[PDB]
Design a binder for these strands. Structure first.
Lengths: 424, 305, 227
DNA sequence: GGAAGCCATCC
DNA sequence: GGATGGCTTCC
């Protein structure tokens, strides 16, 4: 009805846009002939283009542009093992991307735009009378258009792969292998690219940003993503994957998947007296963040005392593990044990928390350090940790602070036992 | 699913140009499927020639170095590429992106077969080290000996030999040579727990593993609520997309004597932790177990918690 | 071309250069006669990009100015000395204080928050009188940035503010964040007659504001109480 | 003839 | 920058 008239108006607008690039020599007559041919047989020209195009959710060309294989439109079932990530998690909000010729992509975009407005996007298969009455196509032209649209909506592919795919093995239980060819998902990354764009950009996002600059706290959330990596698809033109790669501009943001200490910085192990005093504190970036979180978690209440005690125990265990790991990294990162000039208490701690007695150290001092493990170094470290954690009489007067002191004592005892087992 | 008899330790493995991406979503450490396939190929190398079968792997990642850079105007990062040679007419190659990295790892291998029965264990460890020193892990070629001649020898450790306190002593003296690295597990249980605590909000599944590993800044009641561990996402494996296909019926295979199927990646969440936080060191072996009746192809470390 | 964000100005440097092959320009951020930051930005930048290049420095300056010129806090304690019952942020001190420690002779005391406390005993009705009289508006910290002689109540010492001082409170870049149209409607004027006030120089068709309109405008914006 | 090759034009 | 072809366009 009105959709075919809108398609004819869009064809006339495309003819006017093709007449905007007009040549003064002979562009007028060619533009008039092209507009006449378009307004005559736009559907007859578009059926042969819609026969060429296929809708797809998994694509092989992002693996390599020179390879060609089977491209599949399929939503696999949800697996039995719970707690996973796949395409099965969403079914209602999918957006399929198509591979094909560029003028065919223009014809498919025109067919999708005619699919909007009315219910034509789902009714392109089941509609004869109103569609043929609106489009100006006849009964035979409408039947041929319905056949071409049912063909373009179909896959129409042969099962084959290429030599530049991955097609890896996976062993079977107690038996042989299968070949496993992976396909690049495109609808899933279009969805999460939309979600990541909405996270990084949006009125609510910038409003929460200026909120966290002004610390005005209206009921709202604020998300943030650190250290993404950016990948580029193909050469300069991105649409050769699909039109989804045209609207994503050939860009995919990658999530960080890193080991904890991936910035190998130099160690300030050396014998500074104030350096030894600060190393007894041990102010680091992650250690400073943990100390800030522990200081912020001091003023809590006891209504969530189960979850609060669990979070406090997890934070204390993480702090103890980070301290032991930093001590081990400082020890093994040390190439040799040097006699520190004026390392005030640094020698008393580094009798055990420092490296083995090398040629720079005395053999009698090494035997004396092997005679007595650093229990007093553990006591000084527990004292520095208890001084780092802000305490008050509310914890002394309350039973929850006594339980937190008992948990800190158990953690300090475990750390002292782990130190004394390796020590000596 | 099976407890090995002895534990084998690969001391200090230094790699260069290992593949960084290894995933359509992540770019950090490579998947443990490469390690499981590595010890499977190692078992196919000299494992059957010594009456030994090998089951699982432990990884610690002593140090990391990725050839990456920051493009001076934003907070993202671009990868670093290399120069392919010229095309057929001599114009220019086609640019594909790939990530390289440098690793330092150690491998912990379980032994089920006749360890001390057929041969002494140290010669077995020495010959399997000599065999493994001619392969690659994830495209990354193994470096040879450098001037650290100290981590040259290997070690074999029967886990259940002797008393219980003797077991604690030998596992602790094996842990002592494993200090600076951070072991990695699966964390599907905490993922399911936070699913059900987030299903109280709404029933979504992938948004869980989206939300659980980002810097989430809550409003003032400027707080940042935190997860206890170092939770890192990981590809769990594969789910099917096609039926099981005949070994000849598909064109352009590697070999026409192996069945074929099309798959899509499955994902999960791991965690990096210190080896002194676990007591049983046999809780740390990755096992790729296949379930071909459905699509669930899965590597994990069970018997860990 | 300059950009004006409240009392701040961002100017370019009149002759660019080529850095990395691309043409650039130096920009400077001013606060009155005081220069604060300098950056080097390329061309093909819209003015919004030049805005949020400096937005963070603006926000930090706002945070520091808010914390420094915060008003004083009094508190109400019972006879023991601890367990503060209510707090209030005043703009002046109640003039009768002298250093005290509360005892059991009275059940209510009104102490300061500073450490060598001053204090007074009250009886919950005069406390409400002092709270009504001496309270502080929500945006009282903006008065720390003003010259004082434009803030006095005595008509003999008052002088009208200039345009740069007047941009501290009116305009979308100002600290109150109120428009010129809304401030004109707050005074019962047209938008044009209010824009007459903020031209920039009285030779270029600009009039001084009155005493009464200035103090009433400071009252209605929640800056000075102006009893 | 048929293929391949190049160029070309589309998006 | 991949895809399809159309008149040329060899041998």
């Amino acid at each position: 009805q009105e959709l075919r008239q809108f398609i004819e108006s869009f064809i006339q607008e495309r003819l006017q846009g093709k007449l905007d690039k007009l040549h003064p020599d002979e562009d007028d007559k060619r533009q008039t002939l092209l507009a006449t041919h378009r307004r005559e047989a736009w559907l007859a020209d578009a059926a042969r283009r819609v026969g060429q195009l296929q809708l797809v959710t998994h694509t092989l060309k992002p693996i390599h542009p020179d390879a060609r294989g089977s491209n599949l439109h399929s939503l696999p079932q949800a697996p039995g093992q719970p707690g996973l990530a796949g395409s099965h998690e969403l079914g209602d909000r999918l957006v399929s991307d198509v591979v094909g010729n560029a003028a065919a992509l223009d014809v498919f975009k025109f067919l999708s735009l005619q699919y909007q407005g009315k219910n034509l996007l789902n009714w392109l298969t089941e509609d004869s009378a109103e569609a043929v009455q609106a489009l100006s196509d006849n009964a035979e032209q409408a039947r041929e258009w319905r056949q071409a649209f049912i063909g373009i909506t179909a896959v129409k592919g042969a099962p084959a792969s290429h030599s530049l795919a991955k097609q890896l093995y996976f062993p079977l239980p107690g038996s042989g292998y299968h070949l496993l060819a992976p396909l690049f998902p495109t609808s899933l990354v279009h969805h999460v690219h939309a979600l990541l764009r909405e996270a990084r950009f949006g009125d609510a996002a910038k409003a929460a940003r200026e909120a966290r600059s002004r610390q005005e706290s209206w009921p709202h959330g604020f998300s943030e993503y650190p250290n993404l990596a950016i990948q580029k698809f193909g050469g300069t033109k991105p649409q050769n994957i699909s039109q989804l790669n045209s609207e994503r501009y050939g860009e995919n943001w990658l999530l960080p998947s890193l080991p904890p200490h991936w910035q190998r910085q130099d160690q300030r192990a050396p014998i500074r007296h104030s350096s030894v005093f600060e190393h007894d504190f041990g102010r680091s970036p992650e250690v400073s963040r943990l100390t800030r979180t522990l200081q912020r978690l001091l003023a809590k209440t006891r209504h969530n005392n189960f979850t609060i005690r669990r979070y406090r125990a997890q934070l204390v265990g993480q702090i103890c593990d980070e301290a032991l790991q930093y001590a081990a990294r400082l020890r093994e990162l040390e190439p040799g044990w040097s006699a520190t000039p004026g390392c005030q208490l640094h020698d008393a701690e580094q009798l055990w928390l420092d490296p083995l007695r090398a040629q720079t150290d005395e053999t009698f001092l090494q035997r004396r350090l092997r005679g007595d493990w650093p229990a007093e170094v553990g006591n000084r470290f527990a004292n520095w940790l208890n001084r780092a954690v802000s305490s008050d009489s509310q914890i002394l007067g309350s039973p929850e602070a006594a339980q937190w002191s008992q948990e800190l004592s158990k953690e300090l005892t475990m750390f002292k036992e782990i130190l004394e087992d390796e020590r000596d | 699913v099976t407890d090995p008899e002895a534990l084998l330790l690969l001391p200090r493995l230094s790699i260069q140009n290992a593949n960084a991406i290894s995933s359509p979503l992540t770019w950090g450490f490579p998947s443990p499927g490469a390690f499981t396939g590595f010890v499977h190929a190692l078992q196919r190398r000299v494992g059957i020639s010594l009456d030994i079968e090998l089951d699982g792997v432990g990884i610690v990642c002593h140090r990391f170095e990725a050839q990456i850079s920051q493009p001076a105007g934003k907070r993202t990062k671009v990868f670093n590429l290399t120069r392919n040679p010229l095309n057929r007419d001599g114009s220019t190659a086609a640019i594909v992106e790939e990530g390289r990295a440098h690793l330092e790892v150690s491998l912990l291998l379980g032994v089920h077969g006749d360890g001390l029965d057929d041969h002494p264990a140290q010669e077995i460890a020495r010959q399997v080290q000599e065999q493994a020193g001619a392969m690659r892990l994830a495209g990354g070629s193994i470096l040879p000996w450098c001037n650290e001649r100290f981590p040259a020898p290997n070690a074999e450790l029967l886990m259940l030999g002797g008393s219980d306190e003797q077991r604690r002593k030998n596992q602790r003296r094996l842990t002592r040579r494993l200090l600076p690295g951070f072991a990695l597990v699966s964390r599907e249980a905490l993922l399911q727990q936070h699913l059900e605590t987030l299903r109280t909000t709404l029933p979504e599944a992938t948004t869980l593993d989206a939300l659980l590993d980002l810097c989430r800044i809550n409003f003032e009641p400027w707080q940042v609520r935190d997860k206890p561990g170092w939770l890192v996402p990981i590809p769990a494996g594969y789910n099917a997309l096609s039926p099981l296909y005949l070994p000849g019926e598909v064109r352009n295979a590697r070999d026409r004597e192996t069945p074929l199927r099309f798959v899509e990646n499955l994902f999960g969440l791991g965690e990096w932790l210190s080896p002194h936080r676990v007591a049983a060191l046999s809780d740390l072996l990755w096992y790729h177990h296949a379930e071909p009746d459905k699509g669930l192809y899965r590597w994990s470390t069970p018997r860990f918690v | 071309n300059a950009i004006h964000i409240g009392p701040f100005s961002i100017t370019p440097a009149a002759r660019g250069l080529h850095y990395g092959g691309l043409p650039h320009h130096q920009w400077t951020l001013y606060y009155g006669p005081r220069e604060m930051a300098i950056k080097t930005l390329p061309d093909s930048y819209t003015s919004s990009e030049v805005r949020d290049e400096f937005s963070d420095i603006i926000a930090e300056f706002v945070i520091d100015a808010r914390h420094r010129y915060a008003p004083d806090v009094l508190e109400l304690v019972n006879s023991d000395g601890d367990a503060v019952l209510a707090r209030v942020a005043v703009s002046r001190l109640p003039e009768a204080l002298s250093g005290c420690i509360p005892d059991d002779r009275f059940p209510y005391w009104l102490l300061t928050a500073s450490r060598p406390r001053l204090g007074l005993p009250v009886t919950l009705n005069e406390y409400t009188a002092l709270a009504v009289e001496l309270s502080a508006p929500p945006l009282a910290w903006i008065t720390g940035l003003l010259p004082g002689e434009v803030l006095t109540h005595d008509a003999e010492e008052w002088r009208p503010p200039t345009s740069w001082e007047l941009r501290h409170v009116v305009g979308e870049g100002s600290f109150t964040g109120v428009s010129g149209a809304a401030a004109a409607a707050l005074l019962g004027m047209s938008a044009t007659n209010f824009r007459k006030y903020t031209a920039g120089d009285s030779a270029a068709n600009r009039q001084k504001i009155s005493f009464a309109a200035w103090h009433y405008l400071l009252d209605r914006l929640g800056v000075k109480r102006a009893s």
